[PDB]
Structure formats: structure tokens, C-alpha cells
Amino acid sequence: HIPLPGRQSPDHARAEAEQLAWPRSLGLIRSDAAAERHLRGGYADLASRFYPHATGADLDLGVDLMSWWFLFDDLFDGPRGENPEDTKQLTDQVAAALDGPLPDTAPPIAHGFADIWRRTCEGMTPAWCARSARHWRNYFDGYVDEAESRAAQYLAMRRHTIGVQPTVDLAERAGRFEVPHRVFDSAVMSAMLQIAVDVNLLLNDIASVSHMQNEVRARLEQYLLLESCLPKVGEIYQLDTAEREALERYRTDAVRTVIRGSYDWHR
Numbered sequence: 417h418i419p420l421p422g423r424q425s426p427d428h429a430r431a432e433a434e435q436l437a438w439p440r441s442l443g444l445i446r447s448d449a450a451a452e453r454h455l456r457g458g459y460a461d462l463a464s465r466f467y468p469h470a471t472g473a474d475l476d477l478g479v480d481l482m483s484w485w486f487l488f489d490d491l492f493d494g495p496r497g498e499n500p501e502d503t504k505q506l507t508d509q510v511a512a513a514l515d516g517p518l519p520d521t522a523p524p525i526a527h528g529f530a531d532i533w534r535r536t537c538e539g540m541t542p543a544w545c546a547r548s549a550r551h552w553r554n555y556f557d558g559y560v561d562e563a564e565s566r567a568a569q570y571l572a573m574r575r576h577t578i579g580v581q582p583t584v585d586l587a588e589r590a591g592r593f594e595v596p597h598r599v600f601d602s603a604v605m606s607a608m609l610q611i612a613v614d615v616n617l618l619l620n621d622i623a624s625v626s627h628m629q630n631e632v633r634a635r636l637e638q639y640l641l642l643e644s645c646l647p648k649v650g651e652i653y654q655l656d657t658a659e660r661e662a663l664e665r666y667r668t669d670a671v672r673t674v675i676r677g678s679y680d681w682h683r
């Protein structure tokens with residue numbers, strides 16, 4: 417039960433046909449078998465549903481983030497994912513791209529992230545990049561915390577490793593807009609983003625138990641309640657005409673798409 421319209425970028429065919437060129441050029445995919453395994457994931461299709469408002473190079477950046485993220489998560493399914501020290505050793509080299517240029521000795525997965533992070537920040541305000549860099553560190557730090565494992569207790573850990581916030585951040589960059597920063601920090605928007613995080617991880621774990629389906633139903637109903645409060649929220653923070661349009665873009669092209677896009681991709 418998701419009362420949100422399914423949407424997909426009109427440039428999804430070209431983005432899916434060219435998805436392999438970027439990971440091959442950064443050494444993330446080096447064999448024809450690895451390429452076919454990547455195409456079987458449908459990651460470009462997922463990006464076209466997360467970012468239906470993006471075409472061309474903007475959508476290609478969304479495809480690359482999906483390609484990089486699943487290539488990154490697969491590097492921890494072996495013995496390294498069980499040892500938290502080796503997990504932090506790799507995430508530190510990736511997260512170092514948020515602090516400055518990476519040394520040439522960095523693994524290819526690190527140079528890949530740096531290329532994505534460089535394109536994510538172009539054209540965005542300095543305060544937006546600092547906030548988005550902060551969101552990545554929260555994911556990497558939560559990735560190390562989850563590695564230190566070798567109902568409410570699992571939510572506090574999975575809410576950072578589900579990666580919804582860095583996905584939503586790219587929708588702003590892909591749409592070339594920024595939600596008003598004081599509205600992002602609002603209690604209403606935080607509750608909406610918390611719903612988008614909780615629903616995404618509940619749907620991903622589906623891969624006595626009907627209690628989870630009703631939890632998704634309840635949070636989606638609460639999400640609609642919070643959406644109706646946004647007009648009054650815009651007045652509380654004294655939004656102008658352009659800021660209200662950016663807030664509307666953020667609601668439809670970033671938060672709504674990250675909830676509906678994951679459902680249509682899993683199904």
C-alpha cells in the first residue's frame with residue numbers, strides 16, 4: 417500500500433544501454449562475467465525510478481551511484497564483512513574522498529566514489545556539500561558499526577546503513593535544486609525522511625510477519641498527514657516563491673521517488 421505514482425525517467429533506455437562504460441573505466445568491472453552480473457541487477461532501471469526528473473548526464477550520475485553502491489556493498493560479503501577492523505580500513509579510504517584528493521594508492525572503489533562525489537558537489541552551495549558530506553560519513557560510520565556484530569534495537573542500526581539519505585541528496589543534485597536548508601532541518605521534514613528510511617528497510621528485509629506490512633501502511637498514512645502540514649511549514653520559515661517551489665520539488669522528486677522507486681524496483 418503506497419499511494420504514490422510510479423514514475424520513470426524518459427531517458428531510461430539510453431542510461432541503461434551505457435551503464436557499463438563508467439565502472440569499466442575506473443576498474444570496478446574488469447571481466448565480461450562481472451559485467452553480466454552487473455546488468456542482471458537492474459541498477460540503471462532503479463536509478464531511472466529514483467530520479468524520474470533527470471535525463472542525460474544528470475541521470476547518468478544517478479546510474480553511477482547505484483552501480484558504485486552495489487559494487488561497494490559486495491566487497492564486504494566475504495571474510496572482511498565479519499572483521500570490523502578490515503571493514504573500517506576500507507571505508508576510511510573511501511570516506512577520505514570527502515576530505516580532499518585521494519592518493520593514487522587508493523583502491524578502485526575509492527577512486528570511483530571520489531568521481532561520484534566530485535560530480536555531486538558541482539554547482540551546489542558550500543553548505544549543501546558540507547551537509548551531504550556529513551550524510552556520507554554517517555553511512556560509513558554506521559557501516560562499521562554494523563560490522564561490529566561478529567525490534568527497536570535493529571532500527572537504530574539499519575537507519576544509517578540503508579543509505580536512503582545519500583540517495584535523496586543526489587535527487588537534489590540531479591534536479592539541480594536545493595530544498596531550503598532551514599526546512600530540511602525542520603521537525604516535519606525530519607519525520608518525513610524518517611518514514612522514507614523506515615519503509616525502505618522494511619521493504620528490503622522482505623527478500624505474524626504481516627505486522628511489518630501494517631507498519632508500512634501506518635507510516636505511509638502518517639507521511640500523507642505530514643505532507644499536508646508543509647504549507648504551514650513554509651509560512652513558519654517565511655519561504656519565498658522560489659523556496660516554496662524547491663520544497664515542492666523536494667517532496668515530489670526526492671522523498672516521494674525514494675519511497676515509490678524502491679517498491680517498483682523490488683516488485
Ligand SMILES: C/C(=C\CC/C(C)=C/COP(=O)(O)OP(=O)(O)O)CCC=C(CF)CF
Pocket residue numbers: 485486489577578579580583616620678
Ligand atoms: C535506498 C537504496 C536502495 C534501496 C534499498 C536497498 C537495496 C538497500 C540495500 O541494503 P543492503 O544491506 O545492501 O542489502 P542488499 O545488498 O540489497 O541485499 C540505494 C542505496 C543502495 C544500496 C546498495 F547496497 C545501499 F546499501
